Each structure stands twice: as C-alpha cells, then as structure tokens.
Ligand binder design. Structure first.
Ligand SMILES: *[C@@H]1O[C@H](CO)[C@@H](O[C@@H]2O[C@H](CO)[C@@H](O[C@@H]3O[C@H](CO)[C@@H](O)[C@H](O)[C@@H]3O)[C@H](O)[C@H]2NC(C)=O)[C@H](O)[C@H]1NC(C)=O
Lengths: 49, 50
C-alpha cells in the first residue's frame, strides 16, 4: 500500500498457502514413492551366448 | 429500480473423489471405474469356439 501515511507491505497467507499445498503433494502422487524388485534377469554378461 | 443476475452450476448430494495433478484429492459430481475387477466366473463359449 502507498497511502498518505506512507508505505507498507503484507503477505497474504491465504493465496500463498493454496499454491504450496498443490505443489507439495503432486510429486508423490505422479510418481510412486517406491516399488520393490528382487531376483530379475542378469543385465550383464562376460561372453557371447 | 435494479435487478441482480447471477450465473452458476449444478451440484449433487454426495460426489466422488478423483486423483488429479494439482490437487491430491478432490470431489466431483460424477465418476466411473476404469478397471474391471468383477468376474462372472464362467467362460462364455461365444464367439470364440471353446
Ligand atoms: C454420470 O453422468 C453420466 C453422463 O451424464 C451418466 O452415465 C452414463 O450413462 C449412460 C446411460 O446410462 C451410458 O451410456 C450408455 O452407453 C451404452 C453403450 O453400450 C448404450 O448401450 C446405452 O444406450 C447408453 O447410451 C454411459 O456409458 C454412462 N457414462 C458414465 C460411465 O458416466 C450417469 O447419469 C451418471 N452416473 C454414471 C452411471 O456414471
């Protein structure tokens, strides 16, 4: 604000919060926090087959 | 001497939740299952000759 009393600044927590909420949760949603796998296929060899 | 005109949308008693990008969970006015989970338990002989 730039009133006759001078200048001043104030952040609106409401608006700011809405953005943060949407941002935070998204990442984990899109990608699965984790997935397990154990015995698989040899992804390497030393000779020709 | 004045009139008020407004716009708006519909609503339902109890909506359903859905997974969206922006919001982790939000309710809509209608949903639908995209994953077949039930099963008759019987093999239908047609069309494929079984
Ligand atoms: C949600 O809103 C939708 C749309 O207003 C409604 O569901 C839809 O209901 C119609 C008719 O019951 C379904 O269409 C049907 O398609 C078959 C295709 O084989 C056809 O044989 C029928 O003659 C009819 O046209 C449509 O699939 C369905 N869509 C969905 C899944 O929403 C309904 O009013 C509300 N609740 C439901 C059922 O989701």
């Amino acid at each position: 604000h730039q009133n006759s009393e001078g200048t001043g600044q104030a952040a609106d927590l409401k608006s700011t919060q809405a953005a943060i909420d949407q941002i935070n949760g998204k990442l984990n949603r899109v990608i699965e926090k984790t997935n397990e796998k154990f015995h698989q296929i040899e992804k390497e060899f030393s000779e020709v087959e | 001497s004045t009139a008020t005109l407004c716009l708006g949308h519909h609503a339902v008693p109890n909506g359903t939740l859905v997974k969206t990008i922006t919001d982790d969970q939000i309710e809509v006015t209608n949903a639908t299952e995209l994953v077949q989970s039930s099963s008759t338990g019987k093999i239908c002989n047609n069309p494929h000759r079984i």
